[PDB]
Design a protein around this ligand. Structure first.
Ligand SMILES: *[C@@H]1O[C@H](CO)[C@@H](O[C@@H]2O[C@H](CO)[C@@H](O)[C@H](O)[C@H]2NC(C)=O)[C@H](O)[C@H]1NC(C)=O
Ligand SMILES: [Cu+2]
Ligand SMILES: [Cu+2]
Ligand SMILES: [Cu+2]
Ligand SMILES: [Cu+2]
Length: 495
């Protein structure tokens, strides 16, 4: 189902059994995954979030992030708890009111309090472009062609320990999937196609953790969009998609009428596809209603390599074509030790007063800002470079920057930089020990922007910092509505 751009979104508890195991959940709009929130580029989104949560087990406070939306002028609407807001308390509501100029493509939204999105608050967000330059490449683009991949846990997020390696109990594709252990023959998701039609498939990782090896038996996939950025056409036969990344790919339904397995292998949890784990069904109209009996290629011969992606537009790369060729070049020391992650020796632990409120109240510098050592100021209109050398305990970490997308100057498993035409995205794997994944952007968006690993268990264990971008201009650029000012006093009173 699609809603928006102006809509109510209620946050409720519901028990669900996507793999046959009933357990509690935190739902947006009453379904798992949440409904698709949608609009056209340039639309005013007004999402009134009614928090009706009752089950403390998963926290009754909530806060929602519109993942990959830049929020320029509306840093207050971004969603991360204690960075841009206090959580909305149960029984109250809050209007995330914002515009999406410049932006089109496939996004998503999720709770950004603690590890609550794991417990089910996650869904797709699609900005349609009525003048999409990729339109002529396909026949069908609609709600039936969105594909979500989700990790699902039998253990309540708040009780995951932490961290402490943690693994999912099943993979859900469009909210259905089978349990990795003691697999019950529960219903699988079906994605129906018609002989000869081309589909814009919108592949969305809503994962709290694992990355997926994604393929469709018998079929190719032509990538045309990455984390919201239009790409040149890239035909692959397998896609490794890390947590919170998105691809649009063209599926040409050119195989014989029949049933073909859709495969998404997580990097942890259940391995293989026995009894239909890690699986969904590609069904052609006219096929018999039966399980596919297809096999993956023994070796995939054209799997996605990030370095083969190129923007469709002439995005290029900011700065100079050498490492340090930026106004403010950074190299973050990403560590793990004793159950906590650090960035430059500091583990993130949420401040009592949100970063933005601190600024609104008169803070001027990162030194003025709490938590100490968890904030780095950026000057305005400057080319930033962030090197993110990997090695820290597992791995591979998908880093995400709020309020921005970014050139991937250097990708995983490859030490050659690209200062001509690398793909731009918003979530990138930092690869493995010895890699030096590097990103670049321009500071054109005043506000405190979260930078964190999108493995949510790694976020709760401190793997994050705030880029306080243009502290001096922050208040002026981001006028807040009174409802936002009301958040922290309510939350603090309630607690
Ligand atoms: C990965 O990339 C960064 C560059 O973006 C490298 O940073 C250099 O590091 C050395 C020592 O750490 C400094 O003396 C230089 O000033 C840095 N060069 C700059 C900032 O241009 C970093 O060493 C690399 N990390 C690796 C390969 O793990
Ligand atoms: Cu996110
Ligand atoms: Cu985000
Ligand atoms: Cu991580
Ligand atoms: Cu985030």
């Amino acid at each position: 189902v699609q809603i928006g751009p102006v809509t109510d979104l209620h946050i409720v508890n519901a028990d669900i059994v996507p793999d046959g195991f009933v357990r509690p959940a935190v739902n947006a709009g009453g379904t798992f995954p949440g409904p698709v929130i949608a609009g056209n580029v340039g639309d005013n989104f007004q999402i009134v979030t009614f928090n009706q949560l009752i089950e403390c087990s998963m926290l009754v406070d909530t806060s929602i992030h519109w993942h990959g939306e830049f929020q320029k002028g509306t840093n207050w609407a971004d969603g991360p708890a204690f960075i841009t807001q206090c959580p909305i308390i149960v029984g109250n509501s809050f209007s995330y009111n914002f515009n999406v100029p410049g932006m089109a493509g496939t996004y998503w939204y999720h709770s950004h309090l603690t590890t609550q999105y794991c417990d089910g608050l996650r869904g797709p967000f699609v900005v349609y472009d009525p003048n999409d330059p990729d339109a002529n490449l396909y026949d069908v683009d609609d709600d039936t062609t969105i594909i979500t991949l989700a990790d699902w846990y039998h253990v309540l997020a708040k009780e995951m320990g932490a961290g402490g390696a943690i693994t999912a109990d099943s993979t859900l594709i469009d909210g259905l999937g089978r349990t990795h252990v003691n697999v019950a023959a529960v219903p699988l998701s079906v994605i129906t196609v018609e002989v000869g039609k081309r589909y814009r498939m919108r592949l969305v990782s809503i994962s709290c953790d694992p990355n997926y090896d994604f393929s469709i038996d018998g079929h190719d996939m032509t990538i045309i969009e990455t984390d919201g950025v239009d790409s040149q056409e890239l035909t692959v036969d397998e896609i490794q998609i890390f947590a919170a990344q998105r691809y649009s790919f063209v599926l040409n339904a050119n195989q014989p009428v029949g049933n073909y397995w859709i495969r998404a292998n997580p990097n942890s949890g259940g391995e293989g596809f026995d009894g239909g784990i890690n699986s969904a069904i590609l069904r052609y109209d006219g096929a018999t209603t039966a399980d596919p009996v297809t096999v993956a290629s023994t070796v995939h011969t054209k799997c996605l390599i990030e370095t083969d992606l190129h923007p469709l537009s002439r995005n290029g790369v900011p700065g100079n074509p050498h490492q340090g060729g930026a106004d403010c070049n950074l190299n973050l020391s990403l560590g793990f030790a004793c159950g906590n992650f650090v960035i430059n020796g500091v583990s993130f632990t949420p401040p009592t007063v949100p970063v933005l409120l601190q600024i609104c109240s008169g803070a001027n510098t990162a030194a003025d800002l709490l938590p100490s050592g968890s904030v780095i100021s950026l000057p305005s209109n400057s080319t930033i470079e962030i090197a993110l050398p990997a090695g820290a305990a597992g791995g591979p970490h998908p880093f995400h920057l709020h309020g921005h997308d970014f050139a991937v100057s250097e990708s995983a498993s490859n030490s050659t930089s690209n200062y001509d035409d690398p793909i731009w995205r918003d979530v990138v794997s930092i690869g493995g020990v010895g890699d030096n994944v590097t990103i670049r952007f321009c500071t054109d968006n005043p506000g405190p922007w979260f930078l964190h690993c999108h493995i949510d268990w790694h976020l709760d264990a401190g793997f994050a910092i705030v880029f306080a971008e243009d502290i001096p201009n922050t208040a002026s650029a981001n006028p807040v509505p009174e409802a936002w000012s009301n958040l922290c006093p309510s939350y603090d009173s309630a607690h």
